[PDB]
From a paper:
From the same micrographs that revealed the dATP-bound dimers we also resolved dATP-bound tetramers. We obtained a map from cryoSPARC at 2.8 Å, which was again improved with DeepEMhancer. Two dATP molecules are bound to each ATP-cone and one at each of the specificity sites, giving a total of 12 visible dATPs per tetramer. The tetramer reveals an arrangement of two dimers (chains A/B and C/D, respectively) in which the ATP-cones are all well-ordered and one ATP-cone from each pair mediates interactions between the dimers. The ATP-cones have an almost domain-swapped arrangement within each dimer relative to the core domains. Remarkably, the pair of ATP-cones is highly asymmetrically positioned with respect to the twofold axis of its core dimer, being displaced as a rigid body towards the other dimer. The asymmetric arrangement is associated with two distinct conformations of the linker 93–103 between the fourth helix of the ATP-cone and the core domain. The rest of the polypeptide between residues 103 and 121, including the NxN flap, is disordered in both linkers. Interestingly, all contacts between the two dimers of the tetramer are mediated by interactions between one of the ATP-cones in one dimer (B or D) and one of the core domains of the other dimer (C or A, respectively). The amount of buried surface area is small: 717 Å2, or around 1% of the total surface area of each dimer.
RNRs produce all four deoxyribonucleotides and are the only enzymes providing de novo building blocks for DNA replication and repair in all free-living organisms. Class III RNRs, which only function anaerobically, are dimers of an α subunit (NrdD) with a stable radical close to the active site, and binding sites for allosteric nucleotides. Binding of ATP activates RNR, and binding of dATP inhibits it. Here, we present structural, biochemical, and biophysical studies on the ATP-cone-containing NrdD from the human pathogen Prevotella copri, showing that the binding of dATP causes increased flexibility of the C-terminal glycyl radical-bearing domain, as well as a flap-like loop that binds across the top of the active site in the active form.
Numbering used by the authors:
A (entry chain B): 1 to 103, 120 to 305, 311 to 645, 652 to 674
B (entry chain A): 120 to 305, 311 to 315
C (entry chain C): 422 to 527
Amino acid sequence: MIQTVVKRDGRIVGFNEQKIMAAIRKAMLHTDKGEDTTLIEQITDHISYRGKSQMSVEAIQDAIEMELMKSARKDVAQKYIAYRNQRNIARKAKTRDVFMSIVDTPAGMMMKFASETTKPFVDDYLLSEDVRDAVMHNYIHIHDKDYYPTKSLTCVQHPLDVILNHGFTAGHGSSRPAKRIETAAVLACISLETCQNEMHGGQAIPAFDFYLAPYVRMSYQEEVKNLEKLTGEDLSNLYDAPIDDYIEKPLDGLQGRERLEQHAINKTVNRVHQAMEAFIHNMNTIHSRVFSSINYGTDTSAEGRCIMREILQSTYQGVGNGETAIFPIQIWKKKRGVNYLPEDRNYDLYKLACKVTARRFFPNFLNLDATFNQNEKWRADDPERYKWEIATMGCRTRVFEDRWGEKTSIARGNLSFSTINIVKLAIECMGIENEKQRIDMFFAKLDNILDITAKQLDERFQFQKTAMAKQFPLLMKYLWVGAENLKPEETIESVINHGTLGIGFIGLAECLVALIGKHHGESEKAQELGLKIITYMRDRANEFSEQYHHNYSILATPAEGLSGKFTKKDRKQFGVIPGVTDRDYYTNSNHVPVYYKCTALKKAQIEAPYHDLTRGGHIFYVEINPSVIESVVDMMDKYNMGYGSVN
Amino acid sequence: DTPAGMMMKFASETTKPFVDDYLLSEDVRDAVMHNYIHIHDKDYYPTKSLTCVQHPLDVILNHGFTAGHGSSRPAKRIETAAVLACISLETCQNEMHGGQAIPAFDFYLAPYVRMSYQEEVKNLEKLTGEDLSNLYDAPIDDYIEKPLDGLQGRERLEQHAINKTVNRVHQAMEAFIHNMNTIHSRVFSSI
Amino acid sequence: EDRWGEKTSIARGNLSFSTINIVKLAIECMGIENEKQRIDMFFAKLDNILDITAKQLDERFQFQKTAMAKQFPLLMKYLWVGAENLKPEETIESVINHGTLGIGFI
Ligand SMILES: Nc1ncnc2c1ncn2[C@H]1C[C@H](O)[C@@H](COP(=O)(O)OP(=O)(O)OP(=O)(O)O)O1
Ligand SMILES: Nc1ncnc2c1ncn2[C@H]1C[C@H](O)[C@@H](COP(=O)(O)OP(=O)(O)OP(=O)(O)O)O1
Ligand SMILES: Nc1ncnc2c1ncn2[C@H]1C[C@H](O)[C@@H](COP(=O)(O)OP(=O)(O)OP(=O)(O)O)O1
Ligand SMILES: Nc1ncnc2c1ncn2[C@H]1C[C@H](O)[C@@H](COP(=O)(O)OP(=O)(O)OP(=O)(O)O)O1
Ligand SMILES: [Mg+2]
Ligand SMILES: [Mg+2]
């Protein structure tokens, strides 16, 4: 017989036959007909004679189910094998994440639930047949698929003045204009973090200098008024008194009316200083609690320089007890005639920027004079030059050109983008030995995959339109080109076309290995094909733009949600191949693989033409004194490099 | 209509039935299903949360806090104390499902009007070099406000302080009120 | 130690204890001869005796409460964890739980 049973916790107890009996009884009591001891006795006696000296709970339940199957009453087992499993899941949720297998902070868990619920429904009921077939076999990737039912857009560039000038009202919240520096950065943060809930991407504030520039004068005037309230003087000509730069130096060593004019500047500089560190800390804490970006570096006034110096000092110091802040992402604009050469006005700020970037990895650098960023309306005397300066985002996105509007990056955004798998096509075609036929097949398949991707992007577009204005309280009332003309319940079909659609690529070196023995950064013949394929994609993009009445651009994906999602599913189907499916990366859009020893010069040489070719986004990342970054910036200027991020 | 609302709706709808059919005894489920008991905030059951809490703001103000990759340092002025209070409220909201409250707001924010009044006086010393050191702990009955007309000397160089630490507090209070009222799209708050 | 207080040994003490015979169980488990089944019935009986013993201790604890503080003069008024808060008529329910209960062998 059986004498000892080991409980699940670990205790050892004696064999009681009255517990294997009540369990089956409760299972039977919910199955229409409910029987009596006639079968209970048989099952219990059969179990308690064939067993060993000591048993476990799980083994006994295995025996119970095995006997309840080999009976005539099989409607009692199907209510056993279910209750037991529910209890297993319940007792396994005290230390694990069982609820996720079926489909840490509370908010993150709820968001995971929602994402997993939404994704398959879109994958089934919304896409079309050809698109679905393409997606299933690992040919393309639709970025941010879980927000599809919400007719959402990617990002925007805030016209921050339209909110500071007048008052903004969202829901029951209302806010008046600003009248000093402290109440300006706060409103900038409010508007920057209020629009995340209306979009599924990053946020940016261009012209960080000009928009806040008028707000370094107001505090100066107020301080003068307070310094002439008690003194009885009539310092009425100090209001619009031209200034050279808001520098601060010690006060002792003067007297009279020249003593009450250096103090005001000192207090004003301190006031402006505290606000910027508050801004940085706020944006840094919000993330852990929200991508963000700010652009500056091309203002030659006296207030703009003050703001730039204050922000640079605050970032160089750090946050908290000296830690490096992760946000906001800061980007420095370089132009030939403003801040580059020693004779230019803002050389000192450039040197300070290099000093800080040598340590805290910000700001990045954006060549404002590249051959594909220049604009033919930038006038150095206008007080509104910023309207003709390119601006970029932390996601490496570019929105400059337009076939039906002006050439600006203000109050514009991106609407979607999808990446295309290219290594798989080369591996698939690898079969035939003749070289020419492999290239012919590659070009034959690339066209079809491109057509499918374009159709998917257009269908996304057609769905995104038809969204009422009220669904986006802030974006479609103050921060989009056509706002101020849209009624609360009108569709946004008349202003949506001022946007962009991207087609991204990933892993070109592997694609080259599958058609030649060397990648782009090892053999001269290799690059002649990479250039050709990128050129093919750009030409087809132009054709699609003409056909569908939209804007299309090529893209180097940021590699944030799609890093290994492609290589794993490719090793399984086709198995290991040397140097193609053996690393668990797939390299980025068009860089040189990180595992190949190469210098800065050669990498830049091989990469610049691609920068020219990819209008929708590009990068040039190099991993390592303030003089080091000078070499990087000079390298960017020498060639047509657009956006560098050395750090 | 906003994307966040739709995502939250999906989450709650996907979480309720699992709670009903996995993490409840038979009697509880029957009582729930027959309109006998209602469990407040059942969509948050797998997120083992708590509802309301009364904030000890002293620990947040005196020292700082290190959550995630963020950081902060002690507050040495009213305008940088109110903001920390708001930040604590909004950051603790995401880890619960109820409201947030601050008891004895007055006591918690009392010890910073005085620091402001000290910095304001120190600002006057660098202009009219004097001592003005009998005021750092001078006893003030009330920071009442009156016009600065009909005074002279050191008796007017002190009223000015009472007249400039009465407006920073005004701005900070109104900024707090506005900030906690714009959470419509940026939370339940009590003071 | 403690599970509802701080680590101290002042104004604290025992409440009661009981001792559990061990050898009788080994003697009873002597007919067995497998050398591995014999050692298991021992644990089988030990678990049950421990269960009943804990139940007895809890019952004695339940009876010990309901004792008015006026029948322990110089203990529930000056010498205990926190008796400066009780009254002659109040029972000592709110404070008794700072003591420890014991199980011994031989
Ligand atoms: N004394 C026992 N003798 C034999 N088998 C037992 C005994 N106790 C439990 N089992 C085994 C067989 C029963 O089919 C199965 C279910 O027992 P059950 O009493 O529901 O669980 P349990 O003993 O782990 O504790 P609980 O009281 O929490 O349910 O466990
Ligand atoms: N409502 C029911 N429907 C069907 N079978 C049931 C039901 N209740 C109990 N049973 C059967 C199957 C269970 O394996 C067996 C033991 O039930 P029970 O003691 O509630 O579970 P358990 O001991 O495995 O769970 P727990 O994790 O709560 O200890 O009885
Ligand atoms: N954190 C905040 N979030 C939202 N609104 C805020 C916040 N802080 C202040 N506000 C409000 C206060 C005002 O309504 C507006 C900013 O106005 P501001 O230029 O600072 O002064 P004001 O107009 O209130 O001053 P005055 O009292 O002289 O009229 O924004
Ligand atoms: N809006 C904000 N968001 C987040 N943290 C903030 C915000 N405003 C202030 N802080 C935090 C950052 C500072 O570390 C902390 C204390 O600020 P503050 O009183 O200016 O101290 P401090 O170290 O700058 O003092 P001081 O320069 O006057 O000696 O408050
Ligand atoms: Mg400070
Ligand atoms: Mg105001």
